[PDB]
Structure 1
Amino acid sequence: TQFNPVDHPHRRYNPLTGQWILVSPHRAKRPWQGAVLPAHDPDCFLCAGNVRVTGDKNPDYTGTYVFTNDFAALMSDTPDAPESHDPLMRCQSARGTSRVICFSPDHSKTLPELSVAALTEIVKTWQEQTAELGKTYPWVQVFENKGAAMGCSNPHPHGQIWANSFLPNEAEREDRLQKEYFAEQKSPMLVDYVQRELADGSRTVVETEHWLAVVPYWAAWPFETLLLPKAHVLRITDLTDAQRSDLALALKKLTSRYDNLFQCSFPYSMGWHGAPFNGEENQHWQLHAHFYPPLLRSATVRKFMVGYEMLAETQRDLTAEQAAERLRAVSDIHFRESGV
């Protein structure tokens, strides 16, 4: 029999991590089975004008608001751990900080539900923070964890930003791998990849003037996406004001497609990867954002990345292509905003 990945199992390589993903397409050929918050909450610790758990009061903010995590997992003055070469048990130093970013004072409006202007303000804030912390730390990680399924206790819409005095696992790896690719190809790995997907279209989910979001060829989560700018850009702080407002639009369309997929607020973990502030030639980088969502079949049926996946290799049944196709099928205007 002749090989046809739409029918036959195989593994796909993720050039950003150097790992493979096992795909079992015959397992996803079964048809598909069927199937209100206040703008302000009195007890919400993230709400404007409320006191946090430590007693501090948030300001009467009108847009975004950033504050130092009251239980920061890292600090800036941590002493250095001693050096060691123990090939079995050894530790290194860890300094950094963590901040929380409320997207807007409206306790009930998630990203796909915010105006493009509000979202543009969010991008701004991400830039300012990345720009400020990068003055001191080489890796600044902006991210968001949304939804109870992702463990989020508090539903007020917000993200987080952690700064590290070191390049965390994912960052050093993508840094390294992108660098080799560039040393080898003379062009940035993700800039080229964008070209290829723009040309193909099978995994494309949102395309705007300056951005493209696709379910990557090597996606691990069912509806995982990769949002990248179409031009070479190293960090979020390097976007032009036009790419910036367009990113706002791209985000709104992407997350609206996610919510419309199951017509529910779509949980996920997302974040941005950009060049580290380590003072090196960072040409090889291409800024991008990953969105890793757990839902698989409905609002209640998700994917569990356990067992075989933890002990051996990530595996998926639904193809990245079928995923993208289901995502293209829905509208890119949030259901709550269209009323349909």
Structure 2
Amino acid sequence: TQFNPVDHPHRRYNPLTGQWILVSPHRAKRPWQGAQETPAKQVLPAHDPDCFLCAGNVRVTGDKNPDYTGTYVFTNDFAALMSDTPDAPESHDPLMRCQSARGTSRVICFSPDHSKTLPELSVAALTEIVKTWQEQTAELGKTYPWVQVFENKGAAMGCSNPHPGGQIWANSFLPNEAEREDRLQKEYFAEQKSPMLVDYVQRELADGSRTVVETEHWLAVVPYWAAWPFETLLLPKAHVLRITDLTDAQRSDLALALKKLTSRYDNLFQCSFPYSMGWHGAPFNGEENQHWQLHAHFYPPLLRSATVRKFMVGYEMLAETQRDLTAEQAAERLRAVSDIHFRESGV
């Protein structure tokens, strides 16, 4: 038989992590008698008097939020890391070893509007968010080699607070992902003479099967090696080391691409579409970071619909990630919808 990626299971390589992805084209034809997701509520207030994240409201700790009108950043009340944690007793023990961990955690409210998600925000507003991401990265980076910007959107994605926003966690070390991506890029670079993702963006621009968003300065695709159903990879077209390096143009442009990508996401099932996303850029380790290329990852769980998600368990935990749909199928369905939030379009 002729090999048919659409019907034939195969494995794809993720050069960023060095891991394989199992693709099993028809897996989703099976009966689904499992959990049924709960789609988001259609009626929220712009201000929730009981929301710890709302403006002019008191946090769980009694501390009062300012009367913020834009973005708002504050040290997380339950930080995951601290700047002064004492050093751990480090050994060379090949069985049980530990290491120190310092840093901080900040929370960012995208806006005071309790009911407005990224896709529903102005490009201006979005531009503010980027500026904030930048401001945060630069300050923190002055102190920690790894600054991780991220966001958890929706209950299916473990958010513990319903207010629109993200987080930043700084680390004194290079976390798993960062060390891996760092090393792999560096090796590619040393070998190929060019940045791995810079070349990748080129190939994708020329192909288009996996393209979901394209703007002047940005490209969002369902990466070849994507793991989650509708996972996307957001990259600048030009070579950029960190978020702090973007020009104001690439910056306002980013806002636009974000609006587009998130709008498509919500348009996919005509509902708030949950996910975990975050930025990866060169570490502030004072080294040669030429091999780096700034990028954002979007890991959403929804699969068959608004109430049917993908579960990365069982074989996927004990062996390897296994996808039901191809990256090409995913991109296609994403290209199919409008890039204007249904709420904004009125359609």
> TM class by shorter-chain length?
over 0.9
1:280 aligns with 2:322: no
**Cα distance between partner residues in 1 of 2:33 and 2:4:** 26
- Aligned pairs (5 A) from 1:28-107: 36-107=43-114
**Cα distance between partner residues in 2 of 1:104 and 1:5:** 44
Residue 29 (structure 1) shift? 7.2
Residue 268 (structure 1) shift? 0.3
**Cα distance between partner residues in 2 of 1:311 and 1:33:** 23
Residue 7 (structure 1) shift? 1.7
Q: 1:305 to 1:31 in 2, by over 3 A?
A: closer
Secondary structure of residue in 1 paired with 2:143? coil
Which moves more between the two structures, 1-10 or 212-221?
A: 1-10
**Cα distance between partner residues in 2 of 1:139 and 1:228:** 19
* Runs (5+) with no aligned partner, structure 2: 35-42
Residue 27 (structure 1) shift? 3.3
**Cα distance between partner residues in 2 of 1:203 and 1:274:** 22
**Cα distance between partner residues in 1 of 2:253 and 2:75:** 29
Counterpart position of 1:9: 9
Residue 79 (structure 1) shift? 1.2
Residue 6 (structure 1) shift? 1.5
**Cα distance between partner residues in 2 of 1:54 and 1:31:** 47
Residue 138 (structure 1) shift? 0.3
Q: 1:160 to 1:56 in 2, by over 3 A?
A: same
**Cα distance between partner residues in 1 of 2:162 and 2:240:** 32
Counterpart position of 1:150: 157
**Cα distance between partner residues in 2 of 1:250 and 1:110:** 15
Secondary structure of residue in 1 paired with 2:26? helix
Which moves more between the two structures, 78-87 or 307-316?
A: 78-87
Residue 81 (structure 1) shift? 1.5
1:208 aligns with 2:215: yes
Residue 26 (structure 1) shift? 3.1
**Cα distance between partner residues in 1 of 2:194 and 2:122:** 35
Identity %: 100
**Cα distance between partner residues in 1 of 2:184 and 2:211:** 24
Residue 148 (structure 1) shift? 0.6
Secondary structure of residue in 2 paired with 1:272? strand
Q: 1:38 to 1:136 in 2, by over 3 A?
A: same
Counterpart position of 2:193: 186
Which moves more between the two structures, 23-32 or 66-75?
A: 23-32
Deviations 1:6-65 (A, max 9, x none): 22110000000000000011335799999x111001001000000000001000011000
**Cα distance between partner residues in 1 of 2:180 and 2:268:** 32
Deviations 1:92-130 (A, max 9, x none): 100000000000000000000000000000000000000
Q: 1:31 to 1:86 in 2, by over 3 A?
A: closer
* Runs (5+) with no aligned partner, structure 1: none
Deviations 1:276-307 (A, max 9, x none): 00000100000000000000011110000000
Which moves more between the two structures, 146-155 or 221-230?
A: 146-155
Residue 83 (structure 1) shift? 3.0
Secondary structure of residue in 2 paired with 1:252? helix
Secondary structure of residue in 1 paired with 2:142? coil
**Cα distance between partner residues in 1 of 2:7 and 2:341:** 34
Residue 334 (structure 1) shift? 0.1
**Cα distance between partner residues in 2 of 1:75 and 1:31:** 47
Deviations 1:202-239 (A, max 9, x none): 00000000000000000000000000000000000000
Residue 319 (structure 1) shift? 0.4
**Cα distance between partner residues in 2 of 1:268 and 1:233:** 25
Aligned residues: 339
**Cα distance between partner residues in 2 of 1:328 and 1:293:** 16
Secondary structure of residue in 2 paired with 1:290? strand
Residue 162 (structure 1) shift? 0.3
Residue 153 (structure 1) shift? 2.5
Which moves more between the two structures, 75-84 or 192-201?
A: 75-84
Q: 1:39 to 1:181 in 2, by over 3 A?
A: same
- Aligned pairs (5 A) from 1:230-309: 230-309=237-316
Q: TM-score, normalised by structure 1?
A: 0.98
**Cα distance between partner residues in 2 of 1:267 and 1:20:** 25
Moved over 2 A (4+): 26-34
- Aligned pairs (5 A) from 1:129-148: 129-148=136-155
**Cα distance between partner residues in 2 of 1:308 and 1:98:** 33
Residue 90 (structure 1) shift? 0.5
Secondary structure of residue in 1 paired with 2:220? strand
**Cα distance between partner residues in 1 of 2:234 and 2:143:** 27
Deviations 1:125-173 (A, max 9, x none): 0000000000000000000001011121211100000000000000000
* Aligned alpha-carbon RMSD (Å): 1.8
Residue 80 (structure 1) shift? 1.1
